[PDB]
């Protein structure tokens, strides 16, 4: 045989950032090992900042014509707004890369403060979802004000 044996997939969301200049730091969402740790606590979000989102995930196998990313913002048990999101062709190169949504207002209002829930499926457009999980968004007054 030649080198280890593979066994393991090449594409996987390895985290996701939450970059609003205003907030104390980007939330990262690790998506690799301890996923079952983020339906316990959520991100603290503002009434509806225009904050851009940014997915990474490691490609060191073959290459990926067609990442997509997903995002089901769940809401009191019902879903409310979920789209896909055309990414590109990816090719292994080395390490991981960082994919960037572009602005996204948050749900404002005295009611709309409160945990979503988030159902996110990064899949591509070969045969199958290469990560999914979920997670959900406290949205407050002020984070820093």
Known sequence: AVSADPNVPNVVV???TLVCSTAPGPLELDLTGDLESFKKQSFVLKEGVEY???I???VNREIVSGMKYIQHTYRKGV???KTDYMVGSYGPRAEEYEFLTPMEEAPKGMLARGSYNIKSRFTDDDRT???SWE???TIKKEWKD
Do not use: A, Y
Request: hydrophobic share 40%; no cysteine.
């Open 135 to 137: 997670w959900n968004l």
């Open 129 to 131: 979802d290469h990560l």
């Open 79 to 81: 879903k409310i707004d």
């Open 52 to 54: 851009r989102i940014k």
């Open 56 to 58: 990474s995930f490691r």
């Open 14 to 16: 390895t985290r996701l």
